Design a protein around this ligand. Structure first.
Ligand SMILES: NC(=O)c1ccc[n+]([C@@H]2O[C@H](COP(=O)([O-])OP(=O)(O)OC[C@H]3O[C@@H](n4cnc5c(N)ncnc54)[C@H](OP(=O)(O)O)[C@@H]3O)[C@@H](O)[C@H]2O)c1
Ligand SMILES: NC(=O)c1ccc[n+]([C@@H]2O[C@H](COP(=O)([O-])OP(=O)(O)OC[C@H]3O[C@@H](n4cnc5c(N)ncnc54)[C@H](OP(=O)(O)O)[C@@H]3O)[C@@H](O)[C@H]2O)c1
Lengths: 495, 495
């Protein structure tokens, strides 16, 4: 049956004591990396039972667009613990990422990506003591993939950041820092540009920080953060950032200690945990028996510790590290593909080293920590007052700014709305600015309410119908104020 | 008077042959870096006339929210050439970036950020021959700053990518490659997740590439790209990417050769050119005469060559390089702020070296190239057919998915629309998926047209008014098909 440990984690413990997990082979190199891992697990006599289910490209090919079949959802709800190989996501077309789907379907909001130097895995940073962890928000931001072609030639993607999601991820980061003996957490954002969206993470970071006076909270702008991560990565311990930023920074850090073949990760939520490598399906290596399975193996190790199977975790992790320390069986990504050991040979070596322990690089098994509960989360605040002050109407037209401006002022005449300004790609173009801005066939037209109280729905739709009598609109955004503060930004160049 | 050179570039040439430029001191370290640069210029007898104007924080403090005063716009329209120090943008609140405003006001669509190893500027990558250039799209994507609080606790930023802007940036990259003798261009995108937005750059890249058979065009996913830039940066020559991706990758590359103190840049457009360092106003070093002015100096050098003042550019750049080669006067970012030379001393040393022989005469290899014209650009295609097939209605509510679904189906009864599904943060929650997705108070409700032809505006507004009779909507998106293909995506978990 499924049980809840004292740490609050959910896991399926079989009568014989073994823990049942869902295993997803994946696409490309996936199966090879997972196959290798399962062999090492069995050799180490890991107390596990396996429910193999599919996800990714193989499922897209069955005509299931989400790439996550019902049997796999059923299995994950049964086990609450998953070890998956990479899943292939078509580039530029096709189905949405099944990797993102798994995380969002099961609220595994935290993506933990630790990086450390490895024995006989040389990098220009060897000896600097790089030991940091990137805590990537895992379920919102841009990667949700909510897109709409505003016009035939203008595409739009929504970036959504919530207080709820930001509060969760920053709290997780602090708890993680406090659980690994780290006394500092960096929050990387682009809040100087996205004051509302990225600023939500910055503000959640600052408010939750007050509860962890034992940890130093430092905010850093994401670009300078990338620069610092390359120039002096040893200054970082824990870095928490939004989904997209985290995707790039975590891959940046992996290149500091050997590459993606050595980057494991854990997708953690309160109800489910998904362990997988940070790397992809890597189609050019699939089936060639040359791929490095270290990343997936180390992920299984993270899974073992999560499962409280610390002994097996140390055993497997020691074997791997011992194998690296000796430096006799190294994969192509470390010694070139003209010399690199085969995947199966690498596996066999590690297995042959089960029971052996490295002298230098050893297992740094931190202490488990209870995940923050919803009842202790900082709930979003309900404004004391709020009002709809206008509406942004997006239109598709090639009419020049000045003419569009006069046309809309005429259409709004008689309504309780006035055209305040018009922007193109976010740049004010009406009133004119004296600039030389090039224009696309998409314009955002800001109308402000001029009456008493607030703009009511009927009035807004009436304004939109008037605009529609001549122009094609495709996107509407209400402009609201919450506690006297506008819940929207000005255009670039707008005074 | 303002003239057009035989290369297409516009510059203000005075009666005496001097080229008039607009100079913006900036904020924080800005003034110090600019001040120094001007000193070196005057010493090198650069044939320039300066029109000093302000932008940035000092202007925000005058109550001009755009941070770009009219006199500065007037000056830029007059000179078409600008040398600016960094500008401070408030973090998480306040005014929008004046740096982004200048670029968008004057359509300086390409941000060229060259990176190379410098003498006596130690990095773990020294000797690997890193010599690449990031071509960052400069006027669209997320950095436009178009934001709306969908609900009091859910923020939204629009990511807009146009065919026009993407076509221009990739063509620029190819021309730049062909002009610097580079035989390869990498296009980094996240097209696997954002098939419409990021995919626009990918598709523009591939179609424009057909015009440059002499150049090898390679697409790479942005995350793997960061990994590769850290693991093996010497493989890259030219990298072209969207605005935000480029912001991060360019700073990542700067940390490979000395840090932001050595990263110059050029904001290029057809009508205007703005030269500035990649770094910011760096408030903690402001006024302490310790900041490294190299980045701004080299930007002035890029400016000089733009102005066709090649002799002065070589003179100044050789002096700088000679100074670094001698390694007698190095700034704090190179040898530590405990032994680093003062900004004024570093400057003095360079001026003293005006005329020396840099042993490794690595005056960068550059060849002027004509900017692509609009008449030669691939225009966006006008669909043969198009139709509105539905509407996405975003509502603010905490009513559970199941009940929200039933409520909306009831409201749509009688209309030529049906509720297809409902998502939360991009994840399908209605119909139920069997997942354990956490919900925020923002839901996207997809309605599909069920009649013949297409959904007309009056019918759409009628549906919205019915939804409004019970729920608060704040965001509408029409769903359109162009040439038989949906101009929108499915939700995560939606089959
Ligand atoms: N969580 C996931 O399941 C996940 C994460 C990322 C990408 N993907 C998917 O993967 C497909 C390919 O994407 P991609 O080519 O950009 O990236 P990728 O699969 O991570 O491959 C990029 C490069 O990383 C190196 N690498 C990755 N895994 C390695 C391993 N196990 N051992 C040794 N080297 C390894 C290789 O470098 P060299 O080429 O330099 O040898 C490789 O070509 C897509 O559909 C993508 O969406 C899935
Ligand atoms: N184009 C622009 O005008 C521009 C570009 C970026 C940021 N900004 C603005 O700048 C303000 C501060 O932002 P930030 O602190 O994130 O970044 P930043 O000003 O670039 O400073 C980050 C770090 O870069 C190093 N650095 C930058 N310029 C340097 C130079 N000339 N010489 C030596 N080292 C240098 C320093 O590293 P250490 O601390 O390690 O010494 C510095 O603290 C904000 O308002 C931001 O929006 C403006």
């Amino acid at each position: 049956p499924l049980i809840t440990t004292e740490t609050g984690k959910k896991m399926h413990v079989l009568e014989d004591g073994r823990k049942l997990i869902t295993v997803i082979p994946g696409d490309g190199i996936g199966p090879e990396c997972v196959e290798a891992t399962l062999k090492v697990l069995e050799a180490a006599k890991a107390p596990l039972a396996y429910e193999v289910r599919e996800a990714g490209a193989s499922v897209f090919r069955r005509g299931i667009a989400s790439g996550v079949p019902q049997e796999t959802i059923e299995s994950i709800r049964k086990t609450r613990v998953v070890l998956k190989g990479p899943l292939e996501t078509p580039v530029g077309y096709g189905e949405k990422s099944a990797n993102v789907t798994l995380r969002k379907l099961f609220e595994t909001y935290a993506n933990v990506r630790p990086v450390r130097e490895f024995p006989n895995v040389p990098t220009p940073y060897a000896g600097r003591g790089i030991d940091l962890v990137v805590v990537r928000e895992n379920v919102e931001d841009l990667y949700a993939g909510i897109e709409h072609m505003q016009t035939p030639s203008v595409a739009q993607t929504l970036k959504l950041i919530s207080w709820k999601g930001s509060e969760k991820i920053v709290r997780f980061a602090f708890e993680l820092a406090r659980a690994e003996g780290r006394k500092k957490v960096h929050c990387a954002t682009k809040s100087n540009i996205m004051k509302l969206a990225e600023g939500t993470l910055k503000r959640a970071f600052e408010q939750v920080a007050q509860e962890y006076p034992d940890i130093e909270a430092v905010h850093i702008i994401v670009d300078n953060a990338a620069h610092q991560l390359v120039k002096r990565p040893e200054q970082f311990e824990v870095i928490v950032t939004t989904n997209m930023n985290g995707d790039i920074l975590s891959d940046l850090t992996s290149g500091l200690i050997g590459g993606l073949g050595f980057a494991p990760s854990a997708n953690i939520g309160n109800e489910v945990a998904i362990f997988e490598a940070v790397h992809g399906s890597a189609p050019k290596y699939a089936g060639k028996n040359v791929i490095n399975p270290t990343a997936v193996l180390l992920s299984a190790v993270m899974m073992l510790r999560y499962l409280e199977e610390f002994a097996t975790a140390d055993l497997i992790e020691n074997a791997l590290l011992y194998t690296l320390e000796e430096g006799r069986v190294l994969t192509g990504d470390v010694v070139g593909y003209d010399r690199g050991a085969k995947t199966t040979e690498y596996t066999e070596a590690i297995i042959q080293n089960l029971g052996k322990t490295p002298r230098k690089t050893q297992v740094r098994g931190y202490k488990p920590f209870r995940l923050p509960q919803v009842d202790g989360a900082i709930a979003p605040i309900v404004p004391r007052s709020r009002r709809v002050v206008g509406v942004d109407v997006f239109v598709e037209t090639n009419l020049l700014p000045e003419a569009l401006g006069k046309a809309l002022e005429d259409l709004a005449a008689g309504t309780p709305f006035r055209l305040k300004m018009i922007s193109n790609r976010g740049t004010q173009v009406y009133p004119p600015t004296g600039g030389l801005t090039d224009l696309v066939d998409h314009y955002r037209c800001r109308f402000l309410y001029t009456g008493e109280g607030e703009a009511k729905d009927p009035e807004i739709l009436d304004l939109v119908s008037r605009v529609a009598s001549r122009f094609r609109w495709m996107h509407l955004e209400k402009l609201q104020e919450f506690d006297g503060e506008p819940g929207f930004t000005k255009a670039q160049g707008e005074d």
